[PDB]
Write a sequence for this structure.
């Protein structure tokens, strides 16, 4: 399941799962992803 | 000495039964109703005839 | 999305208010409809 963590996007309930799990808004969540992978061109997550 | 009494079990039976005695003599024949319910609609009483 | 951005206290008070208003609506629906006509269920207490 591909998950949209793009700063500028509303995504699946799954994005929301990430949001409650980490207590973060969409913006900082995107930053967090960028700290995870700097080569990730789009806010997509393998979900693994 | 044997006793036969027509009185209803306290509750509806006794009411029906009391109607039977007041308004008809013994040996009389008539219709009675086993199950009485309060209506889902049109009722505010929690009471039944 | 709104719920996700909450600390545990607001979360607890959320599940609380939800369950309360819910029990209210669910019970008054189960009294008004879906209740077997035999039992005289005309009040909340009677539902209890």
């Amino acid at each position: 399941e591909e998950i949209d963590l793009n700063s500028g996007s509303t995504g699946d309930w799954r994005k929301t799962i990430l949001k409650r799990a980490f207590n973060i808004d969409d913006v900082s969540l995107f930053r967090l992803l960028k700290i995870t992978d700097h080569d990730n061109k789009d806010g997509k997550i393998k979900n693994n | 000495k044997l006793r036969i009494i027509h009185n209803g079990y306290e509750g509806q039976k006794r009411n029906q039964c009391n109607l039977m005695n007041k308004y008809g003599k013994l040996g009389d024949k008539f219709i009675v109703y086993t199950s009485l319910g309060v209506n889902p609609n049109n009722s505010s009483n929690k009471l039944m005839f | 999305v709104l719920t996700a951005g909450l600390n545990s206290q607001q979360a607890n008070t959320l599940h609380a208010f939800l369950d309360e208003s819910r029990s209210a609506a669910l019970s008054t629906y189960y009294i008004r409809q879906v209740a077997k006509a035999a039992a005289a269920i005309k009040s909340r207490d009677d539902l209890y």
In short: Chain C touches chain A through six residues (CB under 8 Å). The two ends of chain C are 35 Å apart (CA to CA). The helical segments of chain C are 8-32, 44-47.
